[PDB]
């Protein structure tokens with residue numbers, strides 16, 4: 001049962017979509033693709049339809065498209081963005097050019113509430129959901145790597161989704177230092193930064209560049225111990241650190257003053273410089289700060305995610321075809 005498509009131009013771009021999606025309203029664009037709000041006549045839900053910009057321009061782009069399609073197809077959890085549909089107007093591989101992704105429409109992102117400073121209880125729920133999302137994603141051996149308020153969608157219900165304001169502000173220091181072997185807890189660092197911003201109303205580490213980013217972080221967290229330097233493989237990294245003016249750790253209680261002690265303690269456990277000691281998503285969920293939300297029965301892990309393709313050097317048409325297969329094999333999620 002192949003659907004019937006109709007065309008239309010919105011802001012310099014042709015959209016060919018299945019009749020099922022109606023009233024396409026442009027709501028944004030970037031170099032990755034553009035998005036319209038739509039009414040899905042099949043489910044009666046408001047959706048976002050994304051049209052990938054230039055999906056198969058180069059090997060880099062084609063391998064990006066396939067990766068985006070693969071991640072979205074895998075995500076099946078209430079606190080992570082998922083895929084209601086994916087389609088193409090093409091009737092065969094040979095004419096396959098365009099990729100459209102469909103997803104629930106979301107009310108606003110986390111800035112559209114940040115810019116205002118939330119009550120403690122809202123902070124609990126918001127950060128709860130992010131961690132609950134993170135546990136899932138991390139369980140699948142996937143790292144977000146770019147968590148920040150603009151990548152978090154929030155309803156008027158305060159229901160939060162992790163989606164696919166400078167990035168650098170929320171980057172774990174070991175990414176700033178260019179470490180190749182960072183773990184999942186780079187996301188926990190970002191959660192820490194986002195959490196601190198919801199409590200105080202202010203960006204914790206609003207650095208002008210990477211050097212400055214490091215200066216501000218170290219001002220709160222202190223210069224590394226014996227034990228941390230003991231574990232840096234990189235000679236220049238190691239000497240930069242020693243090079244710098246030894247900052248002592250701040251007492252977080254003296255920084256986020258007025259904030260909930262249980263909040264200050266989770267921040268302590270999230271914003272540790274040494275990512276080996278940093279609290280994990282699973283562990284953070286069981287922290288008492290989320291006493292009123294935590295439920296180990298209702299914090300599911302994910303199916304394993306096959307990442308073997310990342311190591312594959314293939315041709316554009318090959319990525320193109322693999323993508324084509326992922327388009328075809330999509331099974332829509334079971335309805336409301």
Ligand SMILES: Nc1ccc2c(NCCc3ccccc3)nc(-c3ccccc3)nc2c1
Pocket residue numbers: 027028035048049050101102103104105106107150151152153163164
């Ligand atoms: N970091 C972001 C920021 C904004 C985005 C955006 N914006 C449209 C409004 C919307 C916001 C939140 C949820 C749905 C819609 N749409 C999409 C998207 C759409 C369809 C398929 C895959 C991805 N991703 C976004 C990722």
Ligand SMILES: Nc1ccc2c(NCCc3ccccc3)nc(-c3ccccc3)nc2c1
Pocket residue numbers: 173174177178179180214224231232233234237241273274275276
């Ligand atoms: N077990 C670990 C644990 C943490 C690590 C870490 N994280 C802190 C980075 C940092 C510390 C102090 C000030 C700014 C940033 N960085 C590095 C590292 C960095 C660069 C090149 C090679 C390796 N290795 C780590 C090995």
